[PDB]
Ligand code: F3S
């Protein structure tokens with residue numbers, strides 16, 4: 393499944409690109425995965441758009 | 451890791467009991483796991499307190 397690692401810089405590109413799969417935590421300093429088994433094509437876009445390369449498939 | 455399945459009834463007991471691990475999604479109808487690898491003891495409490503038995507360890 394999809395995970396956000398500790399390299400997250402809170403860029404929030406993933407939230408803008410794929411809102412159905414990524415949300416920011418309450419603190420607002422790390423993205424959260426709402427559906428870790430998503431097949432949406434925006435997932436690939438979010439991974440490719442993360443500067444921190446924080447989004448991975450485990 | 452910890453997951454919330456589709457049986458979630460949005461009881462939000464998990465959010466009250468272990469706020470560092472569970473948050474509600476934006477719609478507010480499903481809990482989200484902020485740290486799926488957490489070892490906090492409140493995780494066990496949240497699992498035990500979920501009426502829907504929606505929280506599991508995969
Ligand atoms: S830095 Fe974090 S907020 Fe999203 S764009 Fe990369 S996972």
Ligand code: F3S
Pocket residue numbers: 454457458459460461462463464465480481499500501502503504505
């Ligand atoms: S119903 Fe859902 S909101 Fe939490 S208490 Fe059970 S996982």
